[PDB]
Structure formats: C-alpha cells, structure tokens
C-alpha cells in the first residue's frame, strides 16, 4: 500500500 | 444545573497541585462549551466561533493526569488519542478517522451525543518538523499530520466504519463544534526562545555574557513564547492558527513536591501506605523526610515521575525482607534513611 | 493463597545466577509487589495505584539476559523476551510497537484479562539510544522516535491487535498495569560519567593531577549513575521517568568464574560432562584450571559468555579424536592442558 524508502 | 469555573477547579485541585494558570483556561472552555451547543440554533450570533487548547509544560508537570481526573467529572464523552500513531494519506499506520471512531466506543455509537465530545491528543510534539524550513522529502510521521488536522479542526465531514470494519457503510459526523485538547513537552524549546529574547550572542566587551547557571529559567521562558516561536521548532503557521488558546505551565517547585504527596488522595504515600495495609502493617512518612526528598528530585529534573526512585531505591531492603519478617506491624522511615547513612526503624507488636 | 516471598524467588534465581545481590532484590521487589497490585480488585481505598518499571544496566555477559529467562520458568503469570532491535517508529515500514502485545497473547492463550496482568522483557535497548546533538537535519525512524512511542504504550493506554494476526477487527488491552523490565549494555556510560566525577583536564599548576593512581572503576562507576548522565549519553527524559528504577550490575571477578561452572546446574563443565556421558566417558575438571580458566577470560573483556573460547580451543584436538579411542573411560584436564605445554590424560577402562 504504502512504502516508507529512506536512506541516511 | 450546569457547573461553574470554582466548581469544576475545585475538583481539579483535589487531583492536581500547583498548577493556577492551567486550570482556569480548562474551566473556562469547559464551562464554555455547554454555552456554544446550547445556544446552538437558537442564538441569532450564528456561526459561533471556536476556541481549541494548547498546552505545554515541562515532563511531569501533569498533562496526561488532567485529562484522566477531567473525565471523571465530565459528562459529555471523552477519548485520549495519541499523535505518535497517526500517519498522514493512509500509510501503514492508523488515519486521523480512527481518532473519532475511538469516541463513538465510548459514546455507544451515539453520533448526536459524539459531536458534543471532547477530544484530547499527548505527545504533539513528536509530529514537529526537525528543521524550521519545510522537508525536501516526503515525511510520514511529522508535517504531513498538521496537515490532516486542518480541515479537522476548523470543521469537516468524516468517515466512520460503525461496525466489523476498517474500510460499505459510512456516518457523517460534522467536527466543527468538536473540541481539542491537544498537549505536548516541546523539547528544546528553550534554546530557540533565548537566541529571540536574549539576543546577546556575542563575545566582545560591549556584547553581554549572561553568568552562568542564572539565566533562562524554563518557568519564565515559556511564558514569553509567541506563535512565531514554534515555527522556528518545526510547526506550520496554518497549524497554530486553529488553536488560538495556548497555556504555559511551570516546573514543580520543591514546595509543591511536598503537598503532591500530602494533600492529593492519590499520592504516591497514600498508595504505599495501601500496599502495606492488606499486609497487616502500617507506615509512615515524617516531614523531615519529604522536604529532603525535594532536593533530590529537582536533581534528577525528570519531573513529579521521578520520585519513585527515590523511595523505591529506600525501600528495596527493607520490602524485600518484610513479608519474611513476621510481627511487624509498623514501619517508620526518617530522613537519614533517604541519605542512605541509617536503616528504617521497625516496630513490632 | 498463599504466594512466594522474596526470599524464596532469590533462592530459584540464585541457583541459575551468582554474584547479582543487588540486581536479585529489584525483580523480587516487583515481582513480588506486582502479584499485589493484581490481587485488588478495586476493593482497596487507594486509587491509582503506582506502578514501578524496572530498567537493568551491566557490562557485556554479565548475566542480563539470563536473569528474565530463568524468571519466566518459575513465573505463574505470562512472560515474553521481546528484541528492540527492529523495533520502528510506527508508520513505518520496517516494524511497530503493537508487535510487542501480539506475542503476549500467544504464551497466555489470547486471555486479555490474563494477559493484562503479565510482564513484558525487552532487550538492546542502548541499540536506540541516539547518539547526537539535537537532530534538525534529520528525523530518526529507530532511534528518538521509537521511545516516544513506547511512552504512550506505558503508563497506560488503548492500543490494537489482530485477533491471531487475521475480519477487519482488533481486540483493546489496557497496559497500566503491565510491567517493562527494559535492559541493555550503554556501551561508553563510563566516559560521560567520568567527566561529571573527575571534575578537571589538570594542564594547569593548580589543579591536580592523577591519571592512573585514582583512576575510576567501571564497577564502582556505574554505580553513581543518575539520570542526567543518561540524557548526554542519547536517552530523552521522559523515556526514563517511566522507568525510575535502575539496576546496575558488577563485572565478573576471578572468584566469581569458578561459582558460575560448579555451582549451577547449567553451567558449561556440566555440559560437556553430559555430552560425553553418552559416549560412555567420565569427565572431569580440577581446581587448577579453573584458576587458569579465570584469569584467561577476564583478560578478553567478554565475561561469561568468552569462556567457551577459551574451554573449546583446548579440547579441540582430543574431541576430534575421542570417538575413534576405544575402551576410554575417563579424561582428566590439568592446568598445563590449558597452557597448552601438555595434553590432556586419558583413561583406559
Ligand atoms: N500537578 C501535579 N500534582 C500531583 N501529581 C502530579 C502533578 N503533575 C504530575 N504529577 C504526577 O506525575 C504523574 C504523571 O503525570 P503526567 O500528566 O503524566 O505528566 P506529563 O507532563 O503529562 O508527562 P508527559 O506529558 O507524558 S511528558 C501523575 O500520575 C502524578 O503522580
Ligand atoms: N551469573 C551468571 N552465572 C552463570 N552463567 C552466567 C551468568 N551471567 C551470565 N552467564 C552466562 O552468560 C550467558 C549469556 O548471559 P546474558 O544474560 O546474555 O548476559 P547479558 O548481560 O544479557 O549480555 P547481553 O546484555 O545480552 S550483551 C548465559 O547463558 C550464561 O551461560
């Protein structure tokens, strides 16, 4: 449904 | 009859010490908002306006505790929700209707009897954006909940599944009548009103250097804060417009430990005292020990919570052999005891 | 009805556990007190009843992890040992809080008000402990987000879970009454702590200087923490009001490795005692190399947990050609076998 993508 | 402010605070009182300026604004809207419904339809100044709550404190300065004692006296439905689990366009997490469906538990389902609620939020400042300029990226935990709470607010039509569902039947409950409480330790705070007020930041002869360790006392720093302050903390203008009522709190004083846990009938004392009271001993709290007491739980600067390691760390020997121990009918702890340089005296029958 | 006493709960853990006094009254204390606060059934004059969470410090192996899985062996009540390592700030991807309350259910047959009154263990929690200056630049998803969140699961509150895992329905469980023995080795504590105790760099004439002779202790160090030391190290304050109880645990000594392989039955020389019984071999470990055994694990800086290193490399060769050797009835491990100068004696029957 809805992805959470982060990269520090 | 309906209540008043000196009513409705007296009661607060019992629950709550040391807090003037924060009862007065709850009563105020309280007693207020049986007047907005209630002339409601039948007052020819129509479109009555509306006026939310902001509060802010230090940690332990009993936010979450007067939204507990208020429901206990208050008649029309009340919920404690939290920010923390909310996520903005349907995420993962749980959505901003999940908080008016929370109500209708409590309301049984009773939509005229919903929107007359109350409503209460903890922790705001968890959805404060990090930086004052507005994130590049897309966040699912911070601004983008001020953002659903707009239209919430101000007033909207929601969707609530009213029975077995998540996601084909929906009750329209208007929200522009609602009210919400919302509350929140803002950390950090205190360094952005100090470069506002103070505006020394400087090193040469002419510039002032405050002296340190006298200067900025979170008691009189809230006070001083403006809208303009929070936005520099992370939070959108358009946000704070919707709560105009902001409440700023002050930290416990050493004067004020002392009647916490004297004067409340659900002081920690009275709750130990409870403990020992199905166990056949009594107990005891001289004065020589609370007022010492005070100046290590002002060290720790954790708030009215952190007391219990106080006495817990005292009492640990002395529980821990207690029930072994028989024909103890009462215990006494003086002040050396807290100092940890004596043992609690012991009385037997 | 006639429940334990801490004496005699010491007593179990006492047998899996050495050298842990101080730790040991803590989690009687609680879990003694814990049983009372249950038995009420709101028939008591005291309301509100305090509750007193438990947050356990010590160095690397030093038996942390050891002390809840043993306690949940002699607990009536339900018990879980929950990894905070992936936990996520909720609204994310990779984990949420409500996690937790889902295994919970599992060990007490989904019984909400059986599961209510159990006690919940978490593990590497310095694994979330930021370490940094106040982070404008970026939000953490697992680091000071994931505490706030925990803030609102304790002290109480209504949160959701899936009846199994799945309907579109979830089932509502207080946590007031739950308990949080939250535990994990702050790696570098004693850096922080060192400047508040030391009080000075001595470049100067004036100030004094001791570099080595009045060195602090790690042990002794630990011992006068506070919870302004744990604010500089990463841990906001009101994650630590919740829990005002602090345990702080020694290191191993010499004398306290030689209890740990005799005294408990789990202990690693009753193992292997076990692992060659099978094969119709006797074992045996003599008092010499367990002293030599001591010194070798305390120079590692591991604790117990280095130990099998230092027992495996040595047995290596003689479990690599043991099951081949015929009519071996007995083995016998000398100090020199750990130095490795000679080999370990064989019996033949
Ligand atoms: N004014 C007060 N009078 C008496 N006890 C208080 C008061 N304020 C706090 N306490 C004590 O502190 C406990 C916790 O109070 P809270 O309302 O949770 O403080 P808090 O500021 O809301 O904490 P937050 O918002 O989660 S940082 C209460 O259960 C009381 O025991
Ligand atoms: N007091 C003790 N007596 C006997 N064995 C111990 C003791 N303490 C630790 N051990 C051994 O060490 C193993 C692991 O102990 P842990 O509880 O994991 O230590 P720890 O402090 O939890 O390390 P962390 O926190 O997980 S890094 C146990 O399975 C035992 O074999």
């Known amino acids: 449904x809805x992805x959470x993508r982060x990269x520090x | 009859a309906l209540p008043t402010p000196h009513e409705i605070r007296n009661h607060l ?48 300065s009993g936010k979450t505790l007067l939204a507990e004692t208020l429901a206990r006296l208050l008649d029309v439905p009340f919920t404690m929700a939290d920010a923390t689990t909310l996520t903005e366009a349907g995420y993962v997490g749980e959505d901003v209707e999940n908080i008016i469906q929370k109500l209708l538990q409590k309301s049984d389902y009773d939509v005229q009897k919903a929107q007359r ?68 330790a803002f950390a950090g705070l205190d360094k952005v009103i100090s470069h506002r007020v103070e505006t020394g930041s400087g090193i040469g002869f002419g510039a002032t250097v405050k002296a340190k360790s006298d200067k900025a006392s979170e008691g009189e720093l809230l006070a001083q804060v ?11 203008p358009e946000f704070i417009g919707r709560l105009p ?38 107990l005891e709290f001289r004065d ?30 002395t529980m821990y052999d207690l029930p072994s121990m028989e024909d103890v009918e009462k215990v006494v702890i003086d002040e050396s005891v807290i100092d940890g340089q004596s043992e609690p005296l012991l009385i037997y029958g």
């Open chain 2, 245 to 282: 009522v902001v409440a700023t709190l002050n930290e416990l004083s050493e004067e004020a430990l002392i009647q916490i846990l004297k004067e409340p009938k659900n002081a920690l004392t009275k709750q130990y005292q409870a403990l020992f009271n199905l166990e056949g001993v009594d």
């Open chain 2, 117 to 184: 609620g109350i409503v209460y939020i903890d922790q705001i400042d968890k959805i404060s954006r990090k930086s004052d300029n507005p994130s590049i990226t897309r966040d699912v935990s911070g601004e983008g909940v001020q953002q659903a709470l707009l239209k919430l607010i101000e007033g909207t039509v929601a969707a609530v599944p009213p029975q077995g569902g998540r996601k084909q039947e929906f009750l329209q409950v208007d929200t522009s009548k609602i009210l919400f409480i919302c509350g929140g």
């Open chain 2, 226 to 236: 403006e809208p303009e302050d929070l936005i520099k903390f992370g939070l959108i």
């Open chain 2, 13 to 60: 009182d019992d629950y709550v010490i040391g807090q003037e300026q924060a009862k007065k604004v709850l009563a105020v809207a309280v007693y207020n908002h049986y007047k907005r419904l209630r002339n409601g339809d039948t007052s020819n100044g129509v479109e009555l306006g509306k006026s939310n709550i902001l509060l802010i404190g230090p940690t332990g």
């Open chain 2, 288 to 317: 020589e020990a609370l007022d010492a007491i005070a100046k290590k739980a002002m060290a720790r600067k954790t708030g009215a919570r952190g007391l219990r390691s106080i006495v817990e760390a005292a009492l640990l020997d």
